[PDB]
Each structure stands twice: as C-alpha cells, then as structure tokens.
Design a protein around this ligand. Structure first.
Ligand code: ACO
Ligand code: ACO
Lengths: 171, 170
C-alpha cells in the first residue's frame, strides 16, 4: 500500500466515504469539523492518503498550539527549568487510522510525521514538547510504547513527548 | 536597512552590555535568562542587531506556544467558532527596544516580524492569533495602536491579534 501523508488540501477532495477508525467521535470529527476548524485556525490537519484518482483518506491527525501546567511534569528538575505556571506546547488533538489499514505501523508513521512538524515548529516558536490526551487505555498504551512520558499520576491520560527528545530523532 | 532582525544565534556573541530599554525587568531578562530559555525550548528569541564585528543588540522579542480562555474574546459570536474552552495561540512573551533607537518605528518593525513568524507557524500548527500581556499602560497603548484587540475588559492588560488579521497583512 503506497500511502502518503500531506496537509489536508484546500479543496478537501478526499474520498472519506466508509472511513471508520473504530471510535465514532473521530469518525464524526473527520466528517463534520476537520476542514472547518483547519480553515478557522483552531487546528491544522494532515491526512494519510492513497494514490487513487480521487485519493482515499485512510488516516488523519490535527495539531494545535497549547500550553500545560508546569506541575504535571514528573521531573521536579524539569519543573525548576520552567519559570512560569505553564510550559509551552503543541497538542496532538486527534489521531486516527482507518480500520482497513490498522495494525501495520501507519499509526506509528503518523506520529513520526507529527514529530517532524513539531520539530520544525519548535525552532521558530517556543515549544517544550508535544502534549496529548489519550482518548482511552488502548490509545494510552499506544503512546506509551512510542516513548511518551506520563504526566500527573499513573492513571492519568495526559502524556507528553519533550522537544528535547524530538531533536534527538533528527540529528 | 541599518539594523536587521534574526533569530538569536547559537553562539550569542552579541554586545548587550549597554542595552537599556527603560524597563529593568526586560533588561535583566535579556542578560540573565533569554539565551537559556531559548535553548530550553521555553521560548524562541529574536534580536534586532547592528552590523559591527561584535553585533550590538538594539531590541529583542520572545515567542512561546500557548492557548487562552475562549471566554476572553469580546465577541460572543467569535467564541462560538472556538469549540473548546481554550483557543490556540502564540504568546509574545517580551518585546523591548533600546532607548537610543526608540521612537523610530523599530518596535513596530519587530511586531511586524513577529506576525510574519506567527503567520508561518499558523500554516503548520493551529494558531488562532497572537496573545500578549501588556507590561504597563505605555506598552498597552503601543499594541492597541498597532491593531490588537482588548480581551476580558477595558482595564485588562491582555491583548490579542487574530491570525485572521495577520493573513490580511500577508
Ligand atoms: C488524542 C488521542 O487519543 S488519539 C487516539 C487514537 N485513535 C483512536 O483511538 C481511534 C482508533 N484507533 C486508531 O485509529 C488506531 O488504533 C491507532 C491510531 C490508535 C493505532 O494505529 P495502528 O496503525 O493500529 O498502530 P500501529 O500499527 O502503528 O501499531 C503497532 C502495531 O502494528 C504492528 N506492526 C506491523 N507492521 C509494523 C511496522 N512496520 N512498524 C510498526 N508496527 C508494525 C505491530 O505488531 C503492533 O502491534 P501491537 O500494537 O498489537 O503489538
Ligand atoms: C509583553 C511585552 O513585552 S509588553 C512590554 C513592552 N516593552 C516595554 O515596555 C519595554 C520598553 N519599551 C520599549 O522597548 C519600546 O518603547 C516599545 C517596544 C514599547 C515601543 O517601541 P518603539 O520603537 O519606541 O515604538 P515605535 O517607534 O516602533 O512606535 C511605532 C508606532 O507606535 C506608536 N506608539 C509607540 N508607543 C506608544 C504609546 N505609548 N502610546 C501611543 N502610541 C505609541 C508610535 O507613535 C508609532 O506610531 P506612529 O508611527 O503612527 O506615530
């Protein structure tokens, strides 16, 4: 499957009929809100797409600028380096892969693409890392295996991947 | 141009000894904290610099990713377009010009550069506009005069410039 990742095109001429990641909220979001919030500067959207005449959308993700409370950091050493109430961040608002193509590493590949975008962004604007709220335990284990660190307590869904680690990816 | 704007270089070999914008907190921050928070990915810093062998720094600013309460926006209609409690933003943490070159448009020129950077950033990551807390009434009038919007109430120092306005500039 020769799939490619792109920012969602202005025309949004994707074939999304039948898209189902197995979580209805993210299926509905793709259909109703992705493009409008992208054009409204609430998020920016990226799509994993096929090479058909009308490219089919097989996955997508969204990024928004954010910040989060310094106290959520597990390392009190890192906390002492943040001289303000909040640490700056980018939030992975949503990530979803279509059922037809799950379990092959496409989810992993989208996260790698996220990392490169956030890395580029971190050079121009202060971004201490990538923040994500795991939607459920299945998603949480997914992010933990990719190396995300746990914020707050051991049963919180708030995870974080530091820019310091992102830059190590692209040396 | 006589002075040029750049992201602060990794070596930070700028001559900052004589810098004085007239607010001691912003002078002290330049000297003690700017470069280390830039390297710490807390902010990214940009400087207005001369062309001497050791470049002299005549101004600087910092940008950090952020978000802010949707309720801050004055227009209840605009609030309905933001489907969450917080709107994504970039914060202008600091902006300062050395007194020797204040009143010549350099502050305005730095803000324009800010907007250009924020505009580029908004293409890749969702950013609803540029957030700033004015340090004092003098700074507040400066940003209002460049077209920033008053958030909360007429007596708050929280101001905002929407990406929608930035796009019209560019
Ligand atoms: C903010 C949020 O919470 S986003 C929430 C995430 N999204 C959702 O919950 C919606 C529904 N879920 C999904 O869309 C998907 O399940 C996702 C995005 C969470 C995971 O996407 P997937 O493509 O299934 O993940 P990915 O295939 O990268 O996971 C690795 C698995 O693929 C297998 N795999 C096969 N080939 C490869 C490869 N080349 N590289 C890596 N992994 C591979 C591994 O065996 C591994 O299996 P295991 O995890 O069962 O041990
Ligand atoms: C988050 C923060 O950093 S807010 C803190 C702001 N920084 C400071 O207070 C530090 C000390 N001050 C400074 O460094 C500078 O005085 C600044 C940044 C506030 C202003 O920069 P300057 O270079 O002096 O301003 P510049 O000459 O570019 O002014 C451009 C325009 O703004 C206007 N302006 C500037 N200050 C004011 C003011 N206090 N009231 C009204 N208008 C003003 C000017 O009149 C000019 O408009 P015009 O061209 O139509 O006449």
């Amino acid at each position: 499957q020769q799939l490619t990742i792109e920012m969602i095109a202005d025309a949004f001429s994707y074939d999304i009929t039948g898209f189902d990641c197995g979580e209805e909220a993210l299926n509905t979001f793709l259909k109703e809100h992705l493009k409008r919030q992208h054009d409204g500067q609430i998020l920016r959207g990226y799509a994993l797409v096929s090479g058909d005449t009308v490219p089919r959308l097989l996955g997508y993700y969204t990024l928004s600028g954010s910040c989060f409370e310094r106290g959520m950091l597990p390392s009190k050493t890192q906390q002492k380096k943040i001289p303000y109430q909040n640490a700056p961040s980018v939030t992975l608002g949503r990530l979803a892969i279509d059922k037809s193509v799950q379990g092959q590493g496409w989810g992993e590949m989208l996260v790698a693409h996220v990392m490169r975008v956030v890395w580029g962004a971190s050079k121009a604007v202060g971004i201490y890392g990538l923040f994500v709220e795991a939607l459920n335990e299945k998603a949480k284990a997914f992010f933990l295996r990719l190396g995300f660190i746990q914020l707050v307590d051991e049963n919180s869904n708030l995870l974080f991947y530091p820019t310091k680690s992102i830059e190590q990816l692209f040396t």
